[PDB]
From a paper:
We identified ScRIPK, a member of the RLCK VII subfamily, by a screen for sugarcane orthologs of Arabidopsis RIPK and rice GUDK. Thus, ScRIPK is a member of the RLCK VII subfamily localized in the plasma membrane. Furthermore, bacterial growth was measured to determine the bacterial proliferation inside plants, showing that transgenic plants exhibited significantly higher bacterial proliferation than that in wild-type plants at 3 days. These results suggest that ScRIPK plays role in regulating drought tolerance and disease defense in Arabidopsis. Like the typical structure of protein kinases, ScRIPK-KD contains a small N-lobe, composed of five β-sheets and an α-helix, and a large C-lobe, composed of six helices, an activation loop, and a catalytic loop.
We also analyzed the ScRIPK-KD activation loopresidues that mediated the kinase functions. This activation loop contains three phosphorylation sites, namely, T250, S253, and T254, as indicated by the electron density.
Author numbering: 4 to 58, 69 to 171, 181 to 301
The structure:
């Protein structure tokens, strides 16, 4: 379930938190990769791990949130002032590092659909949990990928107008930005943006695009209902791998998730139901 580590154990796991194992500064603190051997913890198989240094009832609750499309929380360390979390390591890292490549040759249409479906299943599970788990803003980088490009959600369960909107890159739900109201439907909005990114291969907000195209959502929304002009939106790298019907339906799923009205947005289980026939 959840293992307890000491700092000394996590030093052995991470080579004393060597900068060679530094993975990046995350939303909640620095992240290091590590390796647990078969003998490190009884009942835990040898595997690569991510160790997060955070800059608890909640952590025990996070250890009960088990699902094939959530990153596994393996354990934790609370020692001195320090709070560390130990996660399964996602071999291919976050979706944003693959999706916005110029060519993204390892992400053909069916792999993108598989990623959209797994992310939707993870979010549906979180939304249907004993306590609703909702993100502050569901973004591309909350989707991590294993070696088979299986999607697993990360950082799950972990104001005034200016502070809500400052530094957002297009994933925060409209109603959260303007009123601060956060519900499961706010995640669905961000999921819809990521789905548009998967269909187009373009970042939600790109300042280097022409001003009419800088916001993916505003630019794409009028074409999502136009089946003959949907190819303006679709990733040119995907040409030939989808039918017009398949692209139109996935675009309609995205269209519904990015509705400005939260009441129009689907439940994530309905998104799963809509996308699986495409695969
Ligand atoms: N479980 C994990 N497996 C692999 N890489 C991870 C894991 N958790 C976080 N990372 C990576 O660590 C870095 C910072 O952590 P995170 O907060 O998830 O990313 P970001 O900085 O994009 O918000 C990112 O490169 C992210 O992909």
């Amino acid at each position: 379930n959840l293992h307890v580590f000491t700092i000394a154990e996590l030093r052995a796991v991470t080579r004393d938190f060597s900068m060679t194992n530094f993975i990046g500064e995350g939303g909640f603190g620095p992240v290091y990769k590590g390796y647990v051997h078969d003998k490190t913890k009884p009942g835990l198989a040898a595997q690569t791990v991510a160790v997060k240094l955070l800059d608890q009832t909640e952590v025990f609750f996070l250890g009960q949130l088990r699902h094939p499309h959530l990153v596994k929380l393996i354990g934790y360390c609370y020692e001195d002032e320090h709070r560390l979390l130990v996660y399964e390591f996602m071999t291919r890292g976050s979706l944003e590092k693959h999706l916005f490549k110029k060519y993204a040759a390892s992400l053909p249409w069916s792999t993108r659909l598989k990623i959209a479906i797994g992310a939707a299943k993870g979010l549906a599970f979180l939304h249907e949990a004993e306590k609703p788990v909702i993100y502050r803003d569901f973004k591309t980088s909350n989707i991590l990928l294993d070696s088979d490009y299986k999607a697993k959600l990360s950082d799950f369960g972990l104001t005034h107008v200016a502070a809500r909107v400052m530094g957002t890159q297009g994933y925060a739900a409209p109603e959260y930005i303007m009123t601060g109201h956060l519900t499961a439907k706010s995640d669905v909005y961000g999921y819809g943006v990521v789905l548009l990114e998967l269909l187009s291969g373009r970042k939600a907000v790109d300042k280097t695009r022409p001003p009419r195209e800088q916001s993916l959502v505003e630019w794409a929304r009028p074409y999502l209902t136009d089946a003959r002009r949907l190819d303006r939106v679709m990733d040119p790298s995907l040409a030939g791998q989808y039918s017009t019907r398949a692209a139109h339906k996935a675009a309609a799923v995205a269209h519904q998730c990015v509705a400005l009205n939260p009441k129009s947005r689907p439940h994530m289980s309905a998104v799963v139901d809509a996308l699986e026939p495409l695969l």
